Amino acid sequence: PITGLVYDQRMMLHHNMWDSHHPELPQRISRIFSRHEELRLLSRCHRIPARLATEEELALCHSSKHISIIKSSEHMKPRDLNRLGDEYNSIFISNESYTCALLAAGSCFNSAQAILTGQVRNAVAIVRPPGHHAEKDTACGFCFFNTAALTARYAQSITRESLRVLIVDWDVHHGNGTQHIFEEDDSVLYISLHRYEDGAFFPNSEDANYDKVGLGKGRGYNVNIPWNGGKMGDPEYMAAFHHLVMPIAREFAPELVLVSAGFDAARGDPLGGFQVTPEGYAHLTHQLMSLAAGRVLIILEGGYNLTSISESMSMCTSMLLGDSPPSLLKTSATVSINNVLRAHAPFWSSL
């Protein structure tokens, strides 16, 4: 049983030319990688190589206009980069961003291919920039291409179109791009837990509410778990996994689990304001490993406290290697869970 790891310092080149201390920092990935080496997890993993996604692979989820626009930034002067970035919600662009977004997606392709062919059981991808806010036709929320959504489509393209892909997005923000790419799809089950605050938290859309259950034959395959009024932590996430995530996922019976593993719900995060501990992330990973015969690919999304993300992701990797989990309710969190249960009981007999 082998755990894969992909990391490439070339993804550090994407940077914010006007604010070098912007929280989506190059050192997010180098700090996480360093922590894996300090905790001796690195030596226990099989290094999987990064690669660039092809433009053909990007078109599995994105429009040729969007691909062309981001590609065009590779050679722009600073004023053109500043103006292009301002055309999106919460995006900065440098001459290296496009290449970095290709390396993030291609890293996860090589990881998924390694998992699906049996070279490894599971894998962790320490990649930048993030992916889950990227839409088919636009960048958003520090994300250019939807790495996790592309990986699901990539996985199906090397196996069969009906490969059941579960994407669990525990980034504190709603993966709006992912939700929309798979909204009419019952082959990819999208489950997101996110701070919502009645729609006032980023990305600021009612799309992220519990009543958005999917469209068409995707009805029931989009599970939104939104948190309101409370600084949520391990009890709230544990309970949502026990009551919702794990019962639905078991019924779906995925053949590969992608985690959109943002760590901005972590204790200490400057954007999330939540308090999931590193031990909590270990328990969420350990639960997901009981699906798909442990075929889990943990993909870095957000997470902006360098110490918190480095400890939290390392614990997820520790779980992937087979380590036993370390030892571990707000009233409004019960309201949320009950609201999602009512919305999804019609499509999931486990509920």
């Binding site: 912007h22 929280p23 989506e24 919600n89 919460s90 923000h173 006032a200 980023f202 600021n204």
Partner: peptide
Amino acid sequence: XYXXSXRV
């Protein structure tokens, strides 16, 4: 997403 303005 970052700034404090409300919809970023």
